Amino acid sequence: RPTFYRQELNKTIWEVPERYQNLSPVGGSVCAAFDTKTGLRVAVKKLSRPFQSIIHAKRTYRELRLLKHMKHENVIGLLDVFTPARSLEEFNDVYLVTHLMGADLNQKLTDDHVQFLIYQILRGLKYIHSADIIHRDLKPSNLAVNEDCELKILDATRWYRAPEIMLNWMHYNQTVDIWSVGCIMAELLTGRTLFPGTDHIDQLKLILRLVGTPGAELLKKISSESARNYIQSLTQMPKMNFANVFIGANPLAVDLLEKMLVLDSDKRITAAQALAHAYFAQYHDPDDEPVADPYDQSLESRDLLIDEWKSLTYDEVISFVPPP
Ligand SMILES: CCCCCCCCO[C@@H]1O[C@H](CO)[C@@H](O)[C@H](O)[C@H]1O
Ligand SMILES: CCCCCCCCO[C@@H]1O[C@H](CO)[C@@H](O)[C@H](O)[C@H]1O
Ligand SMILES: CCCCCCCCO[C@@H]1O[C@H](CO)[C@@H](O)[C@H](O)[C@H]1O
């Protein structure tokens, strides 16, 4: 067990191992710190009220288990997790430690830089998706970069949300995340938000303007009678020429965008397919685009008692093994 020290911070007593020095509030709650053991600048998140209720406790367990699973260069991972508690009976607080990411993606980038950034997002998404996990909220603020432009996917604007999420469809496929990637890529290339909707319905209006209204193949897949009737009450419109939306862009970028931003989610390119697209030729390397171990989301989604979630979470803290 490390020697701990106590200090009042962000108006609560933080108790952390002495290896973590010079904590400073960056806003549960996150503080930047310097890890003297590794020489790393880190973020230390003290979870807020982690076991106050069944819902808090279930959320805490899910967050910790997910972060423990993610072991990929382009996905945020867990450097450390600790509690001052020496037993289950004393266990009230949980602290999560990650790389301190100084910048994110949130005015246009060069094509060579867009290649590199989107490659890394897709490499990370291949890994997430291979664990049967959907991110569901990819956006520039969830994409951290360092001073060598190395990117990590992290963890409320609607500008990057797939249209089926906007319609509360459910049955979401992992290409909801590919829609988001397309929106981000477009914005990096043009320096302008692709679909800057003013409210919920305006977002959908702007989307349909680019991609066109549903065709017959897509209409055939709609179970909702009201949706079906609304769509066939609509005035049919063609897909815009993406070449004209992205004037002067690399033709391979435009092609890839056309393959991401398709209304029908079944027809969107996958992360793995996208990595093999010619746009990424200078980066693609099959030998090093790894997949994840299986992740069991059913362990979440149980209806357990607070003390059961708390004990399971404690076990996950004790079993943590740091990365190299
Ligand atoms: C840290 C690893 C990268 C993130 C991959 C896991 C995606 C996070 O999980 C997401 O977050 C939300 C929780 O509020 C939920 O709406 C969804 O169940 C889920 O898509
Ligand atoms: C998949 C089909 C989605 C159903 C959309 C529900 C209705 C959309 O919104 C409606 O349409 C009109 C045009 O914006 C407006 O008159 C109204 O603001 C609104 O009631
Ligand atoms: C007028 C607005 C229409 C929006 C159409 C969105 C269609 C998204 O695509 C759909 O999404 C689902 C979720 O994975 C799937 O089950 C379908 O097979 C698929 O066609």
DSSP 240-266: P-HHHHTTT--HHHHHHHHHHS-SSGG
Q: What is the Cα–Cα distance from 192 to 215, expressed in whole angstroms?
A: 28
- Exp. method: X-ray
23's enclosing H/E stretch is strand 20-25
Residues 249 and 145 both lie in one domain: yes
Residues 6+ apart with CB under 8 A from 57: 50, 51, 306, 309, 310, 313
**Residue 215 amino acid letter:** G
30 belongs to an annotated ligand binding site: yes
Residue 144 CA to ligand 3 centre (angstroms): 30
**Residue 239 amino acid letter:** K
Q: What is the Cα–Cα distance from 35 to 38, expressed in whole angstroms?
A: 6
Residues 150 and 281 both lie in one domain: yes
Given a contact cutoff of 8 angstroms between Cβ atoms, the answer to whether 103 and 144 are in contact is: yes
Residues 243 and 207 both lie in one domain: yes
| Number of domains comprising the chain | 2
178's enclosing H/E stretch is helix 176-190
Residues 276 and 302 both lie in one domain: no
245: domain range?
103-291
Burial classification of residue 81, based on how many CB atoms lie within 10 Å of its CB (0-12 exposed, 13-18 middle, 19 or more buried): buried
Residues 243 and 182 both lie in one domain: yes
Residue 66 CA to ligand 3 centre (angstroms): 27
Q: What is the Cα–Cα distance from 172 to 161, expressed in whole angstroms?
A: 12
> Which two three-digit tokens encode residue 40?
């790393």
Residues 198 and 266 both lie in one domain: yes
Counting ligands in written order, the one closest to the CA of 265 is: 3
Q: How many CB atoms lie within 10 A of CB 211?
A: 19
Residues 4 and 47 both lie in one domain: yes
Pairing of strands 30-35, 40-46: antiparallel
Residues 140 and 287 both lie in one domain: yes
